[PDB]
Specification:
CATH superfamily of one domain in chain A: EF-hand
Family (chain B): Belongs to the RBOH (TC 5.B.1.3) family.
Bound molecules: calcium ion
Largest sheet of chain A: 2 strands, antiparallel
Number of helices of chain A: 8
Strand content of chain A: under 5%
Helix content of chain A: over 70%
Function (chain B): Calcium-dependent NADPH oxidase that generates superoxide.
Protein name (chain B): Respiratory burst oxidase homolog protein B
Oligomer: homodimer
Organism (chain B): Oryza sativa subsp. japonica (Rice)
Subunit structure (chain B): Monomer and homodimer, stabilized by swapping the EF-hand motifs. Interacts with GTP-bound RAC1.
């Protein structure tokens, strides 16, 4: 239970967060921007929904949602997109657990193998460690620049790194 | 200085370590095997030098040594490769610092911007834990499994989930 229940959760929370919780007015306006002849391409699905993840993650979510609906073209109308959206913002637990399951179940057989499970466990941990690292790096950068470029050239030079290290 | 120079020190050691210091015997031998029509591909520089770190680290390193020499083709003759080897193999501080600087300096303008600096700090902090995480994942996976699939059917169902978290 203890470490396993919390690891399923970690994975759920991760997918939920990559999808995000943008309201319909923001998703629809992006649709308006992204659509061509009234239709949203598969490749723009992540951007339309306001997703956080990789391109590949966005497209795989699209296919799991399409697959579920019997949609086989790779193009969505506003009404279809809206129906994909309704599912993804239903923040109910059953609903979220369902969408997570389908997302992690890449071959859509209604089972999850050791491989599928590890896949999403690794992605989520590693993407989360990367985001954290980039916030820190950002703060370490500001400190280096603040110290080696107090006069605000917008850069530092070789000479400044020497000094920083030889000392 | 303290935390500031440690941050910069650690990026310099990360790059130094990823490059390694194989002897010429080894790298020339590897060249001979990796070479095609006399030249060595950018994509094969890492393997030839014996670096660790990512394929991306290897090609960035490559590019930085090329930029320095105005080499714009993505291929090296043996001569040229040996020259790249010689700069890399010089573990004198002056030289190591230069190589580091040029690696961080993606546009070779002799200047390091905030953006360039954030990038090696991120990478020097990131690289190592990928595998460390890939290995924690296996310990979790094969623990989710040995608990949601006690008899080892090989898979988990939605209702195994339903019951897990409810
Ligand atoms: Ca499956
Ligand atoms: Ca630069």
């Amino acid at each position: 239970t203890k470490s396993s229940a919390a690891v399923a959760l970690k994975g759920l929370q991760f997918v939920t967060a990559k999808v995000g919780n943008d309201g319909w007015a923001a998703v629809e306006k992006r649709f308006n921007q992204l659509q061509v002849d009234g239709v949203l391409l598969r490749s723009r699905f992540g951007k339309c929904i306001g997703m956080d993840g990789s391109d590949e993650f966005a497209v795989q979510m699209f296919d799991s949602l399409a697959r579920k609906r019997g949609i086989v073209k790779q193009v969505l109308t506003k009404d279809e997109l809206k129906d994909f959206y309704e599912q993804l913002t239903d923040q109910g637990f059953d609903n979220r657990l369902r969408t997570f399951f389908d997302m992690v179940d890449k071959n859509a057989d209604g089972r999850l193998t050791a491989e599928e499970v590890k896949e999403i466990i690794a992605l989520s941990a590693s993407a989360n460690k990367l985001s954290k690292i980039k916030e820190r790096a950002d703060e370490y950068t500001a400190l280096i620049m603040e110290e080696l470029d107090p006069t605000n050239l917008g850069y530092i030079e070789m000479e400044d790194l020497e000094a920083l290290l030889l000392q």
